[PDB]
Amino acid sequence: LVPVYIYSPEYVSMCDSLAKIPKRASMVHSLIEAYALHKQMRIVKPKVASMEEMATFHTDAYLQHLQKVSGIFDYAAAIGGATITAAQCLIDGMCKVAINWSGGWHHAKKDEASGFCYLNDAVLGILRLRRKFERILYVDLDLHHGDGVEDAFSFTSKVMTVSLHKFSPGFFPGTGDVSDVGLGKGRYYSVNVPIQDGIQDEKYYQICESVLKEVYQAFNPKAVVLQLGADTIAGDPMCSFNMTPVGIGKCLKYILQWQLATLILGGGGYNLANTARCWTYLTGVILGKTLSSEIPDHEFFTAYGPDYVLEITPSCRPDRNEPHRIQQILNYIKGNLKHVV
Ligand SMILES: N[C@H](Cc1cccc(Cl)c1)C(=O)N1CCN(C(=O)c2cc(F)ccc2F)CC1
Ligand SMILES: [K+]
Ligand SMILES: [K+]
Ligand SMILES: [Zn+2]
Numbered sequence: 001l002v003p004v005y006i007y008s009p010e011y012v013s014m015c016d017s018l019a020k021i022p023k024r025a026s027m028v029h030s031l032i033e034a035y036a037l038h039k040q041m042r043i044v045k046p047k048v049a050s051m052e053e054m055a056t057f058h059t060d061a062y063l064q065h066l067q068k069v070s071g072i073f074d075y076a077a078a079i080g081g082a083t084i085t086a087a088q089c090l091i092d093g094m095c096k097v098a099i100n101w102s103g104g105w106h107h108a109k110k111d112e113a114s115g116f117c118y119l120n121d122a123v124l125g126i127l128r129l130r131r132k133f134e135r136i137l138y139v140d141l142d143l144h145h146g147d148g149v150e151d152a153f154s155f156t157s158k159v160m161t162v163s164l165h166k167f168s169p170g171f172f173p174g175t176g177d178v179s180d181v182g183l184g185k186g187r188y189y190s191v192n193v194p195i196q197d198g199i200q201d202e203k204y205y206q207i208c209e210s211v212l213k214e215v216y217q218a219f220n221p222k223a224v225v226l227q228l229g230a231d232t233i234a235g236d237p238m239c240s241f242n243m244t245p246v247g248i249g250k251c252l253k254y255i256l257q258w259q260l261a262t263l264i265l266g267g268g269g270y271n272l273a274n275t276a277r278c279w280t281y282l283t284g285v286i287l288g289k290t291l292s293s294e295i296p297d298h299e300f301f302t303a304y305g306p307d308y309v310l311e312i313t314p315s316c317r318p319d320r321n322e323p324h325r326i327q328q329i330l331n332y333i334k335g336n337l338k339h340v341v
Contacts, residue, residue: 003286004089004098005032005041006082014078015102017071020116020270027276027300028101028266032283034298040287044089046082046100049124054080057123057152062111066118076119079103083121083265087128090223090261097262097286100125101279104227104267106146107173115144115172122225123152125263126159129223133261137221138162139212141251142229142267143238145176149227150190154182157189160219160340164208166240167194178332188339191215194329196320197240201247203321204232208251210330216258218340224260228252228282229267230275234314237270242319244312245281252285273303277310 007029015025032038054063054077066073079102086098106122107115126136126149138153140146140163153159165176182190193211195204228248232241255262264286269275284291293311295304 001095003041004044004086004095005038006046006086006098006100007038007043008045011046011078011082011102014075018075021272024269024272024275025102027272027303028279030299031276031280031295034296035280035284035291037280037283037287037289040289042095044085046078046085049077049081049084053084053124054119056127057110057120059111066113072118079105080119080121080124083125083263084128086263087125090129090263091132096259097256097264099264099283099286101266104142104229104265106140106142106144106149106227106267108148109151114148117148120148120152122146122149122227122265125265126153126225129225129261129263130158133223134158135160135219135222136225137215137219137223138225138227139255140164140227141208141232141248142227143231143236143240144229144268145173145192146227147173147175150176150180150182153186154190155184155186157185160189160191160215160221162191162193162211162215164193164195164204164211166197167192168196171240178329181336188336191333191336193333195241198242198317198319199321200242200314200319201244201250203319203326204241204243204247205250207326207330209254211333212254214334214337218337221258221260224255224258224262225265226252226255226262227265227267228279230269230278231267233269233271233274233278234312235271235274238268242314242317244314245278248278249282249285252282256286274312276300277304277312281310
């Protein structure tokens with residue numbers, strides 16, 4: 001079917017006022033619009049999340065605390081609502097792929113905010129999907145460990161979380177080692193792929209394809225939630241991984257072959273123009289459309305200078321991922337997946 005694109009000018013204007021990502025939502029939407037990708041998609045207005053929908057995960061006391069600390073409660077309800085709307089379109093069979101580039105706030109816990117995440121829209125989207133889909137696979141390709149999502153579903157074998165992230169001393173949130181596998185009946189239903197700085201497209205895709213192939217066979221998912229934070233992209237202030245959207249695009253294309261109901265989320269990404277270049281290219285991957293290298297003129301054309309191209313170039317830095325450590329990591333995951341049925 002035609003992909004669902006979660007959008008309204010009110011939703012974009014609200015997300016533009018977010019702290020460390022000013023005007024990022026407008027930049028992403030206007031680049032997608034400049035490439036005429038919105039014409040190939042079903043524009044769906046996001047509904048604002050009600051107190052009850054947010055309370056499917058968050059405590060009433062924390063939600064009430066969020067109201068008192070606010071305009072953060074309104075941003076939270078709007079983003080959580082946009083993710084719930086994408087899950088609803090998927091539930092209703094309106095589409096096979098539903099996109100909310102302004103979501104993916106993966107660090108937020110039941111009764112505590114963290115890492116700039118005040119509400120876990122991903123958890124809220126997974127819960128709505130569980131209304132029709134028996135098993136959900138959450139895949140997190142953001143530079144950071146999706147700890148809030150993993151923690152939310154740590155006890156259950158009904159939702160499997162897979163996170164590929166930088167895992168190094170003093171690197172936030174500090175969690176997600178290969179030995180972190182969930183608890184109780186959910187033991188071995190949490191997968192963590194610790195990665196070092198300087199990773200490039202080919203090695204990242206080989207790691208990701210290798211884990212997902214094993215995960216898909218052991219878990220047999222009925223729906224997917226995919227978090228695609230652009231903070232892994234070369235040139236990001238995070239200054240860790242050395243990826244391009246071509247590498248992430250391959251992970252995305254591999255997952256799309258499953259032909260399962262897929263909920264697409266954004267995430268981190270502080271180089272604003274590179275984030276928009278990434279998510280625009282990725283929207284082209286979903287639509288199976290190849291984009292012209294030249295950025296078309298639009299409201300934010302000047303932000304793409306001095307090359308004005310969609311392609312991203314890796315930086316001059318070493319790949320700190322030793323081939324023997326990667327195989328030790330993959331072998332340990334294969335050992336864990338022997339307990340997944
Ligand atoms: N993917 C995450 C969270 C996210 C998800 C969706 C959209 C956005 Cl815009 C951001 C991320 O990009 N972070 C959180 C952690 N970071 C921090 O500086 C940091 C923040 C803290 F509260 C404490 C210590 C820290 F070190 C770096 C930025
Ligand atoms: K991740
Ligand atoms: K789990
Ligand atoms: Zn991140």
